[PDB]
Structures are given as structure tokens and as C-alpha cells.
Design an enzyme around this catalytic site. Structure first.
Site, PDB file in Angstrom:
ATOM      1  N   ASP A  25       0.930  -1.331  -0.104  1.00 45.33           N
ATOM      2  CA  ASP A  25      -0.297   0.132   0.476  1.00 45.33           C
ATOM      3  C   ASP A  25       0.848   1.324   0.097  1.00 45.33           C
ATOM      4  OD1 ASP A  25      -3.132   0.712   2.148  1.00 45.33           O
ATOM      5  OD2 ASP A  25      -2.015   2.317  -0.088  1.00 45.33           O
ATOM      6  N   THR A  26       0.924   1.801  -1.235  1.00 44.40           N
ATOM      7  CA  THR A  26       2.149   2.998  -1.360  1.00 44.40           C
ATOM      8  C   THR A  26       1.317   4.185  -0.864  1.00 44.40           C
ATOM      9  OG1 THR A  26       0.867   3.407  -3.705  1.00 44.40           O
ATOM     10  CG2 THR A  26       2.989   1.613  -3.410  1.00 44.40           C
ATOM     11  N   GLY A  27       0.281   3.984  -0.497  1.00 44.46           N
ATOM     12  CA  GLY A  27      -0.303   5.238   0.183  1.00 44.46           C
ATOM     13  C   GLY A  27      -0.563   4.899   1.176  1.00 44.46           C
TER      14      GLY A  27
HETATM   15  C1  LIG Z   1      -1.273   8.192   8.916  1.00 47.91           C
HETATM   16  O1  LIG Z   1      -2.734   7.488   8.411  1.00 47.91           O
HETATM   17  C2  LIG Z   1      -3.026   5.745   7.547  1.00 47.91           C
HETATM   18  C3  LIG Z   1      -1.575   4.850   8.109  1.00 47.91           C
HETATM   19  C4  LIG Z   1      -1.767   4.133   7.470  1.00 47.91           C
HETATM   20  C5  LIG Z   1      -2.671   3.686   6.259  1.00 47.91           C
HETATM   21  C6  LIG Z   1      -3.664   4.235   6.094  1.00 47.91           C
HETATM   22  S1  LIG Z   1      -5.289   4.395   5.174  1.00 47.91           S
HETATM   23  O2  LIG Z   1      -5.631   2.479   5.074  1.00 47.91           O
HETATM   24  O3  LIG Z   1      -6.233   4.987   5.850  1.00 47.91           O
HETATM   25  N1  LIG Z   1      -4.393   4.940   3.790  1.00 47.91           N
HETATM   26  C7  LIG Z   1      -4.454   6.568   3.839  1.00 47.91           C
HETATM   27  C8  LIG Z   1      -5.079   6.889   2.577  1.00 47.91           C
HETATM   28  C9  LIG Z   1      -5.012   7.601   1.612  1.00 47.91           C
HETATM   29  C10 LIG Z   1      -6.072   8.055   0.354  1.00 47.91           C
HETATM   30  C11 LIG Z   1      -6.921   7.706   1.343  1.00 47.91           C
HETATM   31  S2  LIG Z   1      -7.123   6.949   2.187  1.00 47.91           S
HETATM   32  C12 LIG Z   1      -3.946   4.362   2.665  1.00 47.91           C
HETATM   33  C13 LIG Z   1      -5.110   4.091   1.658  1.00 47.91           C
HETATM   34  O4  LIG Z   1      -3.984   3.027   0.672  1.00 47.91           O
HETATM   35  C14 LIG Z   1      -6.382   2.641   1.726  1.00 47.91           C
HETATM   36  C15 LIG Z   1      -6.418   1.733   2.307  1.00 47.91           C
HETATM   37  C16 LIG Z   1      -7.456   0.618   2.235  1.00 47.91           C
HETATM   38  C17 LIG Z   1      -7.525   0.934   3.493  1.00 47.91           C
HETATM   39  C18 LIG Z   1      -9.143  -0.012   3.768  1.00 47.91           C
HETATM   40  C19 LIG Z   1      -9.778   0.018   2.764  1.00 47.91           C
HETATM   41  C20 LIG Z   1      -9.038  -0.777   1.151  1.00 47.91           C
HETATM   42  C21 LIG Z   1      -8.024  -0.021   1.401  1.00 47.91           C
HETATM   43  N2  LIG Z   1      -7.340   2.749   0.432  1.00 47.91           N
HETATM   44  C22 LIG Z   1      -8.724   3.828   0.712  1.00 47.91           C
HETATM   45  O5  LIG Z   1      -9.503   3.767   1.670  1.00 47.91           O
HETATM   46  C23 LIG Z   1      -9.477   3.976  -0.317  1.00 47.91           C
HETATM   47  C24 LIG Z   1      -9.131   3.874  -1.651  1.00 47.91           C
HETATM   48  C25 LIG Z   1      -9.556   3.992  -2.374  1.00 47.91           C
HETATM   49  C26 LIG Z   1     -11.092   3.471  -2.667  1.00 47.91           C
HETATM   50  O6  LIG Z   1     -11.948   3.634  -3.607  1.00 47.91           O
HETATM   51  C27 LIG Z   1     -11.803   2.610  -1.571  1.00 47.91           C
HETATM   52  O7  LIG Z   1     -12.804   2.594  -1.829  1.00 47.91           O
HETATM   53  C28 LIG Z   1     -10.905   2.984  -0.707  1.00 47.91           C
HETATM   54  C29 LIG Z   1      -3.607   5.764   7.056  1.00 47.91           C
END
Ligand SMILES: COc1cccc(S(=O)(=O)N(Cc2cccs2)C[C@@H](O)[C@H](Cc2ccccc2)NC(=O)c2ccc(O)c(O)c2)c1
Lengths: 99, 99
Positions: A25-27
Site C-alpha cells: 500500500d504505497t498510499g
Molecule cells: C496515518 O494514517 C494511515 C496509515 C496507514 C494507512 C492509512 S489508510 O489505510 O487509511 N490509507 C491512507 C489514505 C490515503 C488516501 C485515502 S485513505 C491508505 C489507502 O491506501 C487506503 C487503504 C485501504 C484501507 C481500507 C480499505 C481499503 C483500502 N485506501 C482506501 O481507503 C481507499 C482507496 C480507494 C477506494 O476506492 C476506497 O474505497 C478506499 C492511513
């Protein structure tokens, strides 16, 4: 290896006697794992994403194996719907984005 | 380019002649941008993240130039904490994970 993104980049991780599937998860700045009762000290934290925040427990210096690559670092544990391998560990196993 | 992960993989995108910074997110199925105006018909949609569900507006066949690479596809607009380019568009620009 090279992983394409047609599907979710799920890989097998190992933490102690638990094998789990986790999202590369690069995000995510941080690694977030589903609820599990790890030994040792921890600190409470809030982390925010889509839908809002969840409460997690921060454990430090936790060894974790990702596709047979050794990593060790901070792991956040809480009620995430998905196990997340974040940038803190992706760097340790040599993971880059390429296009 | 090759992008390492010691820093957030934020890149400049071009959408509707506007420049924005967006995060290349392999943990995102879909592309989600913060509140903005886009032309054309949209559909209400709900998406789930780490903290629960949010309402978004779904715009289809939107061109975005991501770091000089052209994509045309679905863009969701709504209360994401940060602009994210998800797998629907990362695949279009040939983005892979490598380690
Ligand atoms: C310090 O805070 C954090 C630390 C570690 C992880 C996250 S995160 O999971 O909320 N998230 C950060 C985000 C950045 C932009 C939007 S959310 C990482 C995302 O890659 C997150 C991963 C995830 C989590 C839960 C369920 C599915 C995926 N992606 C999303 O929330 C997301 C993106 C696109 C979508 O269409 C969707 O429905 C969800 C937060």
C-alpha cells in the site's frame, strides 16, 4: 518480482506464528494489521483514512517477513478491514513504483 | 520514472487544465479526488475505507495526465484525506510495484 495492479497487490506476510494476506500500500505511511495480541509494549494512536479514524496500538521493532523478505519496524494494530503494508516496511524490502 | 518510498509518492497531475498533487496509491482500487468541480453527468456512489463509508460523486471517462502519462477513466470526488490515483488509472499508465 514485478507486481501489476489489475488486481489488489495482496501478498503473504508472516508475523510470529501468523500468516496473513496484506496489501502492498504505497498510499499508507504506516503498516496496519488486523487485531492481534502481540507481546510487548505499545502506545495508543489514531490514524485517519477514508471514512474517518480508527484507534490502533503502535508496536515498535516487530520483525515481519514479506514474500520471504525480512523487515523490522513499527506495526499499528487495530480494527482495519484489511492488512496494510505501508511505506515504513515497503522501503525495507526494496519496493519501488515504476512506469 | 522509478519512484522510491522513503517519501510519499506524490506527483503532479493535470485534470481539466488544473494542476494538482496526488498520491500514487496501490492500496486504492479507485481514484478519489478532494472536492472539486468536474463537467458532465455524475452518479452518487458510496466507498469504504479504513474508517467506514463515505459518499462520493462518480465521473466517468475523465482524462488525467499523471506525471506526463495520459489516463482516461473513472474519477470519484469526495471527502478523501488526500488526492489518490488508484489502480484503475495506475494500470492505464503502466505502473507496477517492483522489489
Ligand atoms: C496515518 O494514517 C494511515 C496509515 C496507514 C494507512 C492509512 S489508510 O489505510 O487509511 N490509507 C491512507 C489514505 C490515503 C488516501 C485515502 S485513505 C491508505 C489507502 O491506501 C487506503 C487503504 C485501504 C484501507 C481500507 C480499505 C481499503 C483500502 N485506501 C482506501 O481507503 C481507499 C482507496 C480507494 C477506494 O476506492 C476506497 O474505497 C478506499 C492511513
Amino acid at each position: 518480482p514485478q507486481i501489476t495492479l489489475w488486481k489488489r497487490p495482496l501478498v503473504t506476510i508472516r508475523i510470529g506464528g501468523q500468516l496473513k494476506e496484506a496489501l502492498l500500500d504505497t498510499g499508507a505511511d504506516d503498516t496496519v494489521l488486523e487485531e492481534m495480541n502481540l507481546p510487548g509494549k505499545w502506545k495508543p494512536k489514531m490514524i485517519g483514512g477514508i471514512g474517518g479514524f480508527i484507534k490502533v496500538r503502535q508496536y515498535d521493532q516487530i520483525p515481519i517477513e514479506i514474500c520471504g523478505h525480512k523487515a523490522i519496524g513499527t506495526v499499528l494494530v487495530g480494527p482495519t478491514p484489511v492488512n496494510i503494508i505501508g511505506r515504513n516496511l515497503l522501503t525495507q524490502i526494496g519496493c519501488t513504483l515504476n512506469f
